[PDB]
PDB file of C-alpha atoms in Angstrom:
ATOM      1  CA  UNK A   6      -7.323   2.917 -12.756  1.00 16.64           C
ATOM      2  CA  UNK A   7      -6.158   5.155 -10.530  1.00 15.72           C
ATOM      3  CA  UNK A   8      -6.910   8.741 -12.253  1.00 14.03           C
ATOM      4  CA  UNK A   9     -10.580   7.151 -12.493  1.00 17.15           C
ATOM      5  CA  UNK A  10     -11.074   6.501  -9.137  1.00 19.82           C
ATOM      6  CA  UNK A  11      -8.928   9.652  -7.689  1.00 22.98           C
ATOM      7  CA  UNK A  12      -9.905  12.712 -10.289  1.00 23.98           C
ATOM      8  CA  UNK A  13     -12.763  11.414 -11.810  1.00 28.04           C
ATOM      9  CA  UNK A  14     -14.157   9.879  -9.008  1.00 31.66           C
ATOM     10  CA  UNK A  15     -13.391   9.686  -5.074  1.00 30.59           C
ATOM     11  CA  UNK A  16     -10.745   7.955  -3.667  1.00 32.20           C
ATOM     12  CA  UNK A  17      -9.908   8.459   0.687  1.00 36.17           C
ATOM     13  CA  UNK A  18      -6.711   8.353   1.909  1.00 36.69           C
ATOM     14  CA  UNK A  19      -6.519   5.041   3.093  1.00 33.94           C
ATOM     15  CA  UNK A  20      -7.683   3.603  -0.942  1.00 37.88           C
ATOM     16  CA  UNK A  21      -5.277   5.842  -2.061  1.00 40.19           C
ATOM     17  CA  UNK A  22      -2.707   3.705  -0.442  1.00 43.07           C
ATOM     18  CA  UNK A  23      -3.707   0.848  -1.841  1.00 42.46           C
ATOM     19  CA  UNK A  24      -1.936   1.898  -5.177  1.00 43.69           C
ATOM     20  CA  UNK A  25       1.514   1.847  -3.200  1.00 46.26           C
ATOM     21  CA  UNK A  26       3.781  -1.305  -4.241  1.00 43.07           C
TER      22      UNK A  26
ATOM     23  CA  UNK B  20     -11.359  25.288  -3.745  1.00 41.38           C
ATOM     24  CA  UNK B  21     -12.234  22.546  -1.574  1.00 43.41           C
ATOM     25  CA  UNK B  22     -13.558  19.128  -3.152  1.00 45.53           C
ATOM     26  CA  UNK B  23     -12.892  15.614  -3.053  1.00 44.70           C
ATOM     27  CA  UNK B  24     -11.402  15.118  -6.523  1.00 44.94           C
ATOM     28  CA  UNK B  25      -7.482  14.639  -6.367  1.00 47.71           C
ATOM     29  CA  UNK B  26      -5.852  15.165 -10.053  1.00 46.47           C
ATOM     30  CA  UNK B  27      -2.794  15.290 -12.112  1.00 50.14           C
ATOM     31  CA  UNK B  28       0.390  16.806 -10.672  1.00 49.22           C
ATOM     32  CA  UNK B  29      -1.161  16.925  -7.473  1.00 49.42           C
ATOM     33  CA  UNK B  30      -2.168  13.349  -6.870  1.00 52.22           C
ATOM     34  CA  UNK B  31       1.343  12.061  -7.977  1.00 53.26           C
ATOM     35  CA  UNK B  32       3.011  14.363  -5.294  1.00 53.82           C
ATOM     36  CA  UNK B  33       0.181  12.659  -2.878  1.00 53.93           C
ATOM     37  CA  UNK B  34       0.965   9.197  -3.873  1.00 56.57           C
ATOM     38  CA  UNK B  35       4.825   9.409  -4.294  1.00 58.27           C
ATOM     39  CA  UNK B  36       4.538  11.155  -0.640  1.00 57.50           C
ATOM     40  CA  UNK B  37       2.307   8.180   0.915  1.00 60.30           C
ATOM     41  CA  UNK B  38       4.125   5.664  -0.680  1.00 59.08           C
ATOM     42  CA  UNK B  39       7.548   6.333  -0.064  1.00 60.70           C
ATOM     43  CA  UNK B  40      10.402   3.916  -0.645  1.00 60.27           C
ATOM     44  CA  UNK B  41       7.560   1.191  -1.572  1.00 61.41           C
ATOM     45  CA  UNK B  42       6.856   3.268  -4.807  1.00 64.95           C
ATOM     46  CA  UNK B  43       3.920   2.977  -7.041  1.00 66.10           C
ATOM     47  CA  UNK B  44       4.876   1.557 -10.375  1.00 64.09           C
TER      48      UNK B  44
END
């Protein structure tokens, strides 16, 4: 999920948006 | 510190800022 691929691992900006509705 | 890893409070106020009205739940 998202706090594994943000904190634990790297997420850019752009994947980050990919967890927008 | 500078790094790559975005966590807790900090990424929500990242995500609820890039997602805007769309919202991310």
């Amino acid at each position: 999920g998202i706090v594994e691929q943000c904190c634990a691992s790297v997420c850019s900006l752009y994947q980050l948006e990919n967890y927008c509705n | 510190f500078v790094n790559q890893h975005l966590c807790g409070s900090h990424l929500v106020e990242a995500l609820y800022l890039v997602c805007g009205e769309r919202g991310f739940f």
